[PDB]
Design a protein around this ligand. Sequence first.
Ligand SMILES: COc1ccc2c(CC(=O)O)coc2c1
Ligand SMILES: COc1ccc2c(CC(=O)O)coc2c1
Lengths: 279, 289
Amino acid sequence: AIPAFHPGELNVYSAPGDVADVSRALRLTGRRVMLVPTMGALHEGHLALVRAAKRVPGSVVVVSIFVNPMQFPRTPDDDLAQLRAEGVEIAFTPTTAAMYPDGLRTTVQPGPLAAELEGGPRPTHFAGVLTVVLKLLQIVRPDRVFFGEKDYQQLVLIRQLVADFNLDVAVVGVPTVREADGLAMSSRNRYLDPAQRAAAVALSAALTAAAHAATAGAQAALDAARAVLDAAPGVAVDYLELRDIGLGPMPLNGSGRLLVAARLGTTRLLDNIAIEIGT
Amino acid sequence: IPAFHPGELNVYSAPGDVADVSRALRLTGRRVMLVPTMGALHEGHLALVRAAKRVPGSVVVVSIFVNPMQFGAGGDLDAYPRTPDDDLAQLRAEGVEIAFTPTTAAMYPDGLRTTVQPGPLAAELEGGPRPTHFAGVLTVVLKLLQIVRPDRVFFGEKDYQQLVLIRQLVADFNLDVAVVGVPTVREADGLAMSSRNRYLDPAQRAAAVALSAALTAAAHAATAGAQAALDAARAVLDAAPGVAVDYLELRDIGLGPMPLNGSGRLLVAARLGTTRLLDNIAIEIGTFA
Ligand SMILES: COc1ccc2c(CC(=O)O)coc2c1
Ligand SMILES: COc1ccc2c(CC(=O)O)coc2c1
C-alpha cells in the first residue's frame, strides 16, 4: 500500500522504500520524475536546478537532501520552506544508516579522471559522490537528473557513470548561478571575510577574460587568465587548466573548458567556463 | 522497438535493442526474467531458464557474454568454451523468447573506466589469488541489469561466493531486482554441473566425484559438530586420486564477518590436473541437524 502523496504540496519522505514507491506510482500516472540531488544548505544555485526541473512538462520534482559522509552546513527547516516556496512536491531526506544499512561495502570505482584536478587533494572524493548518486538514481528512478556546471569535473564523472553502467536516465547540466560581480554561487562563499570575498572575484574575472581572449588562441586565453589571477592578493591557485569538453587533453581548435581552483585562506573555491579556441 | 516475435527465439546483439524490447514488454504487463550466462550451456543453465519460465506471465531473457573483465590475464579467457550453436539450440528447445548476445565493443566502448568495487568478501576464497575477478563479475552484472531491467535475475548456487556478492551488489546499490539462487544440478554420481567439467579426462572425471562426496559426507557427519563435518570431508578428499585441495571452508551462509552458528555453507575448491573445480553445500551443525 503506497505511502500517501498529496499533489501540489511538499511531501517529505525519509524512508528509501517510501520515496521509491511514491516515485514508481507517480511515473505510472504519467508524471516524469526529475531528481535534484543536494547536500542541503540551499542557495540560488540549487533553486536554479529546481527551476529547470519544474519546467519539464508533466514533471514531478524530487530534491534529495543528504550529507554524504563518503565524499566529505545543515539548515533543515530553512531548506524545506525554500522547497515549499518553489512548488516542489517531494523532498527525500534519508538518514546515514538508511542509505548505508550494511555500512560501507560495494562501491563505485571512478575511472582515471577521478585522480585529477579536484582528485589531487581528495583522491576518494569522487568514488563517494558516484556511489551516492548511483544509489539515489536506483531509489528514485528519475527520467532526468540535474547537476550544476559549477562542479564540472563532478558532472563529467556522472556522465561517465551513466554511460559506463548503461543507466537509463538523462543527465542535465545547469549553468552556474553567480553573484552580481561574477563569483560562482557556493555554500562556501559565506566563510569569506571581506578581503577574501574581494579577491575571490578574480576567479570569474580570469575565466571570462580567457573566454574572450580565446579568439587569439589557447595560449592567449591561458595567459589572460593567469594575469588576472596574478593581480589578486591572497589567492593561492591550485590549478588553472584548459581541457576538452570531456576533460581529456584540449584539442587544437574546437571546444574546451577552462577550470580553476584556488585557496583563499582556509576556503577552497572552484570555477570553470566554456571556451572555444579562435572563436 | 525492433522486431519482437512472441513464441520464437529473438536474438539481439545491440544493448539498445534488448533494452527497448525489454521495456516495451514490461509496459505490456509481462514480467522480465534475466538469466545471465557465459554460454556453453549445460543442464544447470537449463534449470535457471526453467525456474524463470515458471514465474507467471514472464518473458525470459538469456544473456550470453564471455566477460573479459572477470578473467585474470594469460589464456583463461581464450581457453573458455564457446558453443553459440548448441547454446541457441537449447534456448529454442526451452521456449526462451529472447537471447541477448552483446559484443565486447558494445559492452566496453571505453574499455575499463567506471567499475564496481566489491566489498571485502571479494578478496577471500576464489578472490584471494584472483583479486580482480569479482570486480569483473559485478561490473558486467550491474550493466546487464541496467540494460535488461528485469524483475528477477537467476543464478546457480554452484558459484556460491558469486551469488552472495551479487546479493551484496543488489542491496548496496538499491537495485530494483529480486535475486533468485537456484540449487546446483548434479550428474548422477553427485558431480556439480559446470561448463568446465568437459576438461576432465576419464580418470579425472572418476576422481571428481570426491568433491560432492566429501561434502554430502560432511553434511551428515555435522550432527557430531563442525570438526567432525570438516574431518569427514577431508578424509574423503585425501583418499581420492589426484585431487589437490585449494581450500575447504566452513562459513556462515552470508560467508562474511559472522562466525558459524548452526547454519553454514561448506565450500571446497580443488585442482584435478589443470582443471579447477568448485562445489559447496548447505551445512546445519547438529541440533539443526
Ligand atoms: C547552478 O549554480 C550552482 C552553483 C553551485 C551548486 C551546488 C554546490 C555548491 O554549493 O558548491 C550544487 O548545485 C549548484 C548550482
Ligand atoms: C543450477 O546448476 C548450475 C550449475 C553451474 C552453473 C554455472 C557455471 C558453470 O557452468 O560452471 C552457471 O550456471 C549454473 C547452474
